[PDB]
Amino acid sequence: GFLSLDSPTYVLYRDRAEWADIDPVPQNDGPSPVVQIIYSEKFRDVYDYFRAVLQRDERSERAFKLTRDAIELNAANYTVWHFRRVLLRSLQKDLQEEMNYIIAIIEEQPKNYQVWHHRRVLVEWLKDPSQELEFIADILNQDAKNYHAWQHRQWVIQEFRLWDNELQYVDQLLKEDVRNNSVWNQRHFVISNTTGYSDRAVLEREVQYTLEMIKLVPHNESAWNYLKGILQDRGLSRYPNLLNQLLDLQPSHSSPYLIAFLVDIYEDMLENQCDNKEDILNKALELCEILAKEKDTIRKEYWRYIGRSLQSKHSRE
Amino acid sequence: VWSEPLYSLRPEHARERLQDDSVETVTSIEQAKVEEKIQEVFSSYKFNHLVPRLVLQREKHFHYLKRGLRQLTDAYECLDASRPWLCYWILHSLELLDEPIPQIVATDVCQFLELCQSPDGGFGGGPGQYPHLAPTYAAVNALCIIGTEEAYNVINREKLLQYLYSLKQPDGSFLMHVGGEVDVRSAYCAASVASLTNIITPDLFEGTAEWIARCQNWEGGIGGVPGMEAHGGYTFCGLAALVILKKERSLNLKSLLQWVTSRQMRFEGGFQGRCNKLVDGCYSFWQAGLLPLLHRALHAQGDPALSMSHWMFHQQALQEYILMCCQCPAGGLLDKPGKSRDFYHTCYCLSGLSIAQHFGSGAMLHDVVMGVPENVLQPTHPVYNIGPDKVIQATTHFLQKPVPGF
Ligand SMILES: COc1ccc(S(=O)(=O)N2Cc3cc(C#N)ccc3N(Cc3cncn3C)C[C@H]2Cc2ccc(OS(=O)(=O)C(F)(F)F)cc2)cc1
Ligand SMILES: [Zn+2]
């Protein structure tokens, strides 16, 4: 990384005297290429020389510096990342300066997969997660829904058992954006791997929290999906007050999600042989109809089918 | 006489605009932005005082594709490790538009993918690049689309199986490449190439269905690895791999159905990839392609309540989204308006459009074709996203040989 690719004084590798001993290796695309990329002079020059060092398996400092340029030109080139990792180890490069390097590249290209993988290999090699939660939090500060960032965080927390402060983090972020589905998923990730959802004091805290969020923002689907998610394994009809308390929200909070949740309760009621079969099924059909027809017509074929499913298995029959 | 045929243009459609409950967050601000932009596309017809009709710009798309199959500008430098992908995206888009492949282009693709093939099995992103399951999947699919003896014979099946065993992990999963990591896409890549070329051993996918099943979460969809947010790309890959493995049942299909159907956007008509994120043309395939797959699964369980005419999503609204919002006037298709075109979005917008047009379940066939009737595309197989004919033909040809080890 001595001479930058965007330096005014950048010089092609073919014009560098410290490379004069080695012959570049042109890409062989055949006599008549398809999907032939007409590379810039800069790109082709770097990759011709990368092909030369890879071919000869030259494990040198100059080769290492070259991988940097090849990565910068195409950071998705997993062949170059592999070779760079061979070099890190052969040359016994200081992995902490390499962490400084990956930190900078991830900041620049946060949605590239190869850069995050490379960081995880280094953390594994160093056996050191001390900078990770803070680094990831900076990335997430720029894009709170970055899928790779969330995955790396999950991996780090899991592998080094760093659960203790995560729920605080989730609550910070949920407060910043209560519609952030990545954060609802993180909340769930943390709880299911620590306390769990059977501790009845916890399940109630969670359900009260969600309902409280649903009340402030009734059309936020993530909260609805969470609520449903944390109650449905056991069965919605196991919680008889739930029906009543949602029906009470309807007056001044009736999203199609409330209605759809109402339908989920009714289906579980009917499946667990509840009181009034002939009836509960009807109330739900009223609801399905309202959804397919009026309140949620994009899903008409779904709600139709739920209707037909509920009819075929819960009528007088 | 006052009857609007286009679902997106009807007056009651304005009710489908975002309700933000007067609580603003980045998420709602961003969704509102897209919706303002899309509404202005929908409203264009009334405002210019012209009658709407939706035309798939087949000629513009064709010229974009036929040119890219040969030569790309330095703008595709970022895909220099994904050249078989470009072959697959381009050849599949051409097969959907019903354009034959000059036998010579066929042979040039063949020779090129031969150069990408690794001696130890699989294909890399370019000549002399190490192998990787993604470009291996793309190479195999492209070769199957070509579908000649020459194309079929480029694939070294023995080495392919070795390569797949080299990536297979203890817990069911597969590495995307050597020294790499696992996700649901790699299992799909492995299942696709393995099933098509007939190299599935009894132990190859041992544990794989259960590993994929661990990826389904509280939402009903599937994340890239266990514990991760549900996402359409991974969900598609998860369910389609399980269809190939005949373990559809490993998942809770009811939560899965409910999750994917929820991912269709009430206003835009297209699909989002995750809950509370923005609409995007490519999910027209990843998300909507789950519906044919769930249909075959639920029908095979004897679900008596399934439609015999329609997939469980608004086929019409998805077509209106793609045709009105996802076409580049110069040729190619798009994530959304104001995004720039590329061959990936061109491939998956067309793939999704085709799925939205063609229902099929037993002897029940039923097309729905919005806009002019020439908009109708060739069908695509929901598991492999190549032509159903290319699939049947390939499987049949490779069943002629034994699973390596026989
Ligand atoms: C130009 O910016 C890019 C960003 C990401 C990528 S990606 O290589 O990581 N890949 C494919 C991809 C290709 C293009 C092109 N041309 C454009 C986008 C793109 N993305 C990003 C994207 C698309 N739509 C919205 N976004 C943010 C997706 C990405 C991941 C991918 C890789 C292989 C895929 O194929 S597959 O599921 O059948 C597999 F199983 F084989 F992997 C599917 C998705 C490529 C370019
Ligand atoms: Zn996309």
PDB file of C-alpha atoms in Angstrom, chain B residues 7 35 65 81 111 141 177 221 223 226 257 260 275 309 331-332 366:
ATOM      1  CA  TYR B   7     -55.170  -2.288 -10.556  1.00  0.00           C
ATOM      2  CA  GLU B  35     -44.206   5.655  -2.889  1.00  0.00           C
ATOM      3  CA  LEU B  65     -28.561  -8.655 -23.969  1.00  0.00           C
ATOM      4  CA  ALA B  81     -15.075 -12.674 -10.710  1.00  0.00           C
ATOM      5  CA  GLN B 111     -15.481 -23.017 -24.603  1.00  0.00           C
ATOM      6  CA  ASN B 141     -27.510 -23.597 -15.573  1.00  0.00           C
ATOM      7  CA  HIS B 177     -15.915 -22.247  -1.486  1.00  0.00           C
ATOM      8  CA  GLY B 221     -39.022 -16.955   6.410  1.00  0.00           C
ATOM      9  CA  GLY B 223     -32.209 -16.219   7.064  1.00  0.00           C
ATOM     10  CA  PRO B 226     -29.454 -19.852  11.885  1.00  0.00           C
ATOM     11  CA  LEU B 257     -46.645 -18.923   3.291  1.00  0.00           C
ATOM     12  CA  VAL B 260     -43.793 -14.445   1.847  1.00  0.00           C
ATOM     13  CA  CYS B 275     -40.018  -6.866   6.325  1.00  0.00           C
ATOM     14  CA  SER B 309     -56.036 -21.026 -11.567  1.00  0.00           C
ATOM     15  CA  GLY B 331     -33.218  -1.807 -22.735  1.00  0.00           C
ATOM     16  CA  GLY B 332     -32.726  -3.855 -19.557  1.00  0.00           C
ATOM     17  CA  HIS B 366     -53.854 -20.771 -16.616  1.00  0.00           C
TER      18      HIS B 366
END
